[PDB]
Amino acid sequence: AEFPELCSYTWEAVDTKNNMLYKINICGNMGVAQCGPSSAVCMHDLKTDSFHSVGDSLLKTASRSLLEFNTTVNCKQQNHKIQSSITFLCGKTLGTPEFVTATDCVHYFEWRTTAACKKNIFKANKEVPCYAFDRELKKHDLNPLIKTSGAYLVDDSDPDTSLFINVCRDIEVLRASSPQVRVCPTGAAACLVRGDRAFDVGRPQEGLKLVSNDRLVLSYVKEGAGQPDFCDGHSPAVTITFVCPSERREGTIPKLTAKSNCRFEIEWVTEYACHRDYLESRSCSLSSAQHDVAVDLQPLSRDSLFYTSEADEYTYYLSICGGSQAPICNKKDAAVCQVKKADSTQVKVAGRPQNLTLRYSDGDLTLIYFGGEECSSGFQRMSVINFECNQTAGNNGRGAPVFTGEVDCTYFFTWDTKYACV
Amino acid sequence: AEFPELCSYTWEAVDTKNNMLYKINICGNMGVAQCGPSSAVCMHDLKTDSFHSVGDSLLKTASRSLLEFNTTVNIQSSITFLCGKTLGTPEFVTATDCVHYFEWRTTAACKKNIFKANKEVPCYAFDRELKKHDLNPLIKTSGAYLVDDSDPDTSLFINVCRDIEVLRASSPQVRVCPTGAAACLVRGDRAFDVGRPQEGLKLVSNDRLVLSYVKFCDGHSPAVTITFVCPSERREGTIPKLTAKSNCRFEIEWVTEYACHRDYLESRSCSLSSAQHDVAVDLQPLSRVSLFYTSEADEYTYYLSICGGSQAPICNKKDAAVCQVKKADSTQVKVAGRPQNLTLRYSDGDLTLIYFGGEECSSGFQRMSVINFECNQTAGNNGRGAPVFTGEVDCTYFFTWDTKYACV
Numbered sequence: 001a002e003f004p005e006l007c008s009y010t011w012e013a014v015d016t017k018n019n020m021l022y023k024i025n026i027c028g029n030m031g032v033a034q035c036g037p038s039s040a041v042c043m044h045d046l047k048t049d050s051f052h053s054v055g056d057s058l059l060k061t062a063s064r065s066l067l068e069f070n071t072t073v074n075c076k077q078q079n080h081k082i083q084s085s086i087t088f089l090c091g092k093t094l095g096t097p098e099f100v101t102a103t104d105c106v107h108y109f110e111w112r113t114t115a116a117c118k119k120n121i122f123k124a125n126k127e128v129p130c131y132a133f134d135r136e137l138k139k140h141d142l143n144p145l146i147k148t149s150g151a152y153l154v155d156d157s158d159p160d161t162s163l164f165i166n167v168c169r170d171i172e173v174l175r176a177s178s179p180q181v182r183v184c185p186t187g188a189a190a191c192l193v194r195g196d197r198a199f200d201v202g203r204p205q206e207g208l209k210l211v212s213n214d215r216l217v218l219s220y221v222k223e224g225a226g227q228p229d230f231c232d233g234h235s236p237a238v239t240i241t242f243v244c245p246s247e248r249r250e251g252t253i254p255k256l257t258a259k260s261n262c263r264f265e266i267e268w269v270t271e272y273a274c275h276r277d278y279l280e281s282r283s284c285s286l287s288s289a290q291h292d293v294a295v296d297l298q299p300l301s302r303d304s305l306f307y308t309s310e311a312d313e314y315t316y317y318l319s320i321c322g323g324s325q326a327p328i329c330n331k332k333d334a335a336v337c338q339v340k341k342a343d344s345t346q347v348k349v350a351g352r353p354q355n356l357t358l359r360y361s362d363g364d365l366t367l368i369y370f371g372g373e374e375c376s377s378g379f380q381r382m383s384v385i386n387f388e389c390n391q392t393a394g395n396n397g398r399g400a401p402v403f404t405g406e407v408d409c410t411y412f413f414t415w416d417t418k419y420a421c422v
Numbered sequence: 423a424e425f426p427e428l429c430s431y432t433w434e435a436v437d438t439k440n441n442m443l444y445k446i447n448i449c450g451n452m453g454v455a456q457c458g459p460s461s462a463v464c465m466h467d468l469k470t471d472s473f474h475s476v477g478d479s480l481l482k483t484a485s486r487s488l489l490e491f492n493t494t495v496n497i498q499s500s501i502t503f504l505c506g507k508t509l510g511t512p513e514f515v516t517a518t519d520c521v522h523y524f525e526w527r528t529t530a531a532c533k534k535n536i537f538k539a540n541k542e543v544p545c546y547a548f549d550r551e552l553k554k555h556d557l558n559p560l561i562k563t564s565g566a567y568l569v570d571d572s573d574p575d576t577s578l579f580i581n582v583c584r585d586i587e588v589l590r591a592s593s594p595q596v597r598v599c600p601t602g603a604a605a606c607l608v609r610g611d612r613a614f615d616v617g618r619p620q621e622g623l624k625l626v627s628n629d630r631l632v633l634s635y636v637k638f639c640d641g642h643s644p645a646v647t648i649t650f651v652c653p654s655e656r657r658e659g660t661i662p663k664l665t666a667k668s669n670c671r672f673e674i675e676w677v678t679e680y681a682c683h684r685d686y687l688e689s690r691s692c693s694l695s696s697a698q699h700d701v702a703v704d705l706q707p708l709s710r711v712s713l714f715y716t717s718e719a720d721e722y723t724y725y726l727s728i729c730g731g732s733q734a735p736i737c738n739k740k741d742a743a744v745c746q747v748k749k750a751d752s753t754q755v756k757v758a759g760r761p762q763n764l765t766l767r768y769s770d771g772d773l774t775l776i777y778f779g780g781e782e783c784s785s786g787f788q789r790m791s792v793i794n795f796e797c798n799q800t801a802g803n804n805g806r807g808a809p810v811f812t813g814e815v816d817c818t819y820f821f822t823w824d825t826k827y828a829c830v
């Protein structure tokens with residue numbers, strides 16, 4: 001199959017400027033009758049409450065990073081039939097098909113996903129859709145929480161048991177630092193370690209479900225034989241409910257609210273359950289109105305016109321928010337530029353200024369730049385600036401970025417500044 | 423401090439044109455009464471038969487890639503170091519009116535220690551005619567040579583002028599050898615160190631060189647003595663032969679054209695002559711093909727324009743005889759050899775075209791390419807054939823090229 005792991009589900013996308021909600025299924029077997037058996041992309045006009053298929057699975061044209069779906073229906077313009085186009089970019093999670101734009105004749109989408117990576121190293125054993133659109137077509141996206149490595153420890157307050165869980169995907173046990181996680185059965189999404197016994201009590205199956213128009217639920221299942229003796233004829237199950245706080249607050253730890261008959265119920269209060277637009281901006285500022293917090297990083301773009309974070313093998317030049325770049329990078333458009341220390345000529349864009357995301361969630365302020373140059377795996381380089389509040393920092397308050405490490409073409413920095421004070 | 427592995431010896435360089443022979447001691451302890459106790463670069467005017475220091479070890483200046491030696495004579499020496507895969511030898515470049523310039527490609531000048539041999543000695547010697555006999559080309563950085571014997575129970579392994587790198591050795595048996603050994607004997611799966619590198623290469627006969635190594639021996643200390651001899655006539659390469667094994671005292675004779683004088687083997691152009699090399703060769707005709715050849719690799723594509731040929735369009739911002747291009751990034755371009763750094767060599771039956779002076783890799787090693795030409799009368803393109811990339815080893819790119827123009 002083409003990007004097989006994506007074919008197991010019917011993915012949703014949306015156009016808010018036009019109140020349209022798209023149903024996407026790369027393999028067409030989405031079964032939405034009102035859209036045709038082989039519809040790969042089914043558009044649902046909300047106002048006229050109708051279903052119009054704009055892409056048929058049997059009329060597919062595929063390339064490395066591009067999927068085109070033609071139809072038989074012709075557009076208003078003669079010799080033109082309706083179609084859908086999806087650009088695939090390598091990602092670190094299964095991600096989501098992002099609506100980019102449509103025209104009378106063609107509907108365009110972009111999809112950063114593990115499925116579209118050359119080096120299949122970025123694939124999880126099993127990952128399910130990790131987001132949901134609400135009644136007002138707003139996206140509640142939990143992708144930022146999915147760990148490509150490690151897991152989270154749930155607070156059960158037990159002394160005899162430990163419980164780890166990953167989000168929308170299996171915990172990567174194979175190469176995990178913590179030797180406590182390495183004992184978990186491969187493919188487990190929820191891992192119960194009781195008295196050095198490590199049991200698998202949940203694997204991802206269905207996608208993220210919006211339940212109360214607000215809350216989100218993810219259910220791991222462990223049906224079948226081999227049920228641990230202490231479950232007493234019951235099959236293990238983990239049900240995580242994510243709730244969006246009425247007001248901003250420090251991130252918390254997913255809490256265990258019930259654990260009888262190996263039927264674990266977990267509650268995770270995280271602002272990642274709130275609509276994306278509440279947590280993010282495409283500029284260097286956030287407001288109380290939209291974000292419930294006001295931040296303006298613009299002043300960090302005022303001794304050269306660029307910040308330079310030194311590294312063992314490379315030099316990172318971070319011109320933030322329109323700030324200008326270092327002369328050694330004034331040859332390419334980039335926000336985070338990487339130069340090889342043993343080769344003043346090997347330069348790499350690890351973040352484009354047009355691809356920026358200012359996010360604030362659970363107490364952490366992050367500035368992300370992406371769409372960087374591709375790494376052999378396919379992943380376009382990306383840089384994440386972890387902002388911390390510090391009223392008293394060098395540079396009349398401002399500060400400077402500190403390259404704190406790279407992880408498979410994603411570069412991490414820390415930036416203590418007063419402008420990061422909520 | 424400052425290339426310590428070059429200080430245990432006195433190196434020589436010649437300016438054959440002016441009949442000058444240079445003595446070089448990076449540590450000013452050569453022992454030459456005529457040049458003085460502090461001389462680092464002693465020049466012996468073979469014409470007037472006199473000595474003149476042109477580099478005082480105390481009047482030194484140094485940086486990663488440059489050694490400068492001043493004097494108090496109304497004069498100085500300059501040595502440019504470049505990362506190499508063998509200890510190498512300092513080559514004389516030129517000499518202005520007051521400066522004597524040299525170039526030394528050596529493992530001692532690399533940014534990473536992974537290139538440095540555990541123990542290596544000078545592997546060359548000048549003769550009475552100031553002609554160089556250099557064995558550097560035979561030095562192995564990975565593995566060793568199997569010595570021809572009789573005993574079906576033992577295998578004699580030797581390397582040239584240095585220890586046998588046993589870690590990534592191409593042979594499994596070699597891997598069993600005791601690190602540090604330059605001569606390794608394997609029997610009943612028991613490897614023994616039978617000889618390590620001590621002094622440099624010695625010139626004993628016009629036509630011969632000897633390298634001595636020291637360490638069932640019956641109290642007798644193991645020793646290996648190798649004799650490299652330049653044959654009267656060109657011939658297919660021959661494995662080194664064990665001519666004597668007496669109580670851990672081995673003697674090996676190796677007939678090899680590398681033991682001959684260097685200009686008999688090489689040319690800084692695309693042709694070799696009967697009169698100078700005993701082989702008439704001219705690869706020039708390959709320069710005209712897309713006047714450039716292309717060789718596919720998994721992650722890269724190599725474009726080759728040899729012997730004054732034209733280079734590919736994607737390599738116009740440089741000067742590369744061989745140019746590498748990353749497939750997943752059409753803009754990542756690396757020079758793997760320059761047209762001005764060409765060396766055509768013929769020895770022990772193999773013709774080799776080497777292009778070097780390429781862009782340095784993080785190790786400090788300038789990328790270079792070596793084409794192993796093979797004779798083939800019927801070769802494609804009216805016999806012009808086409809190169810075939812074969813493999814890379816720490817920034818040295820290897821190609822094979824079957825062509826008629828390679829038949830002697």
Ligand SMILES: O=P(O)(O)OC[C@H]1O[C@H](O)[C@@H](O)[C@@H](O)[C@@H]1O
Nearest residue numbers: 338348374375376377406408409
């Ligand atoms: O695509 P590759 O061959 O895996 O190289 C990836 C590497 O490329 C350059 O060296 C830099 O950008 C590194 O930070 C990056 O990790």
Ligand SMILES: O=P(O)(O)OC[C@H]1O[C@H](O)[C@@H](O)[C@@H](O)[C@@H]1O
Nearest residue numbers: 746756782783784785814816817
């Ligand atoms: O200098 P480095 O960082 O060791 O990289 C060395 C490598 O550079 C490029 O990717 C190519 O030229 C490779 O063939 C080479 O081996």
Ligand SMILES: *[C@@H]1O[C@H](CO)[C@@H](O)[C@H](O)[C@H]1NC(C)=O
Nearest residue numbers: 110352353354355356370371
């Ligand atoms: C990244 O920059 C490009 C520039 O062409 C822009 O088209 C794109 O929208 C940006 N990334 C996204 C999809 O936000």
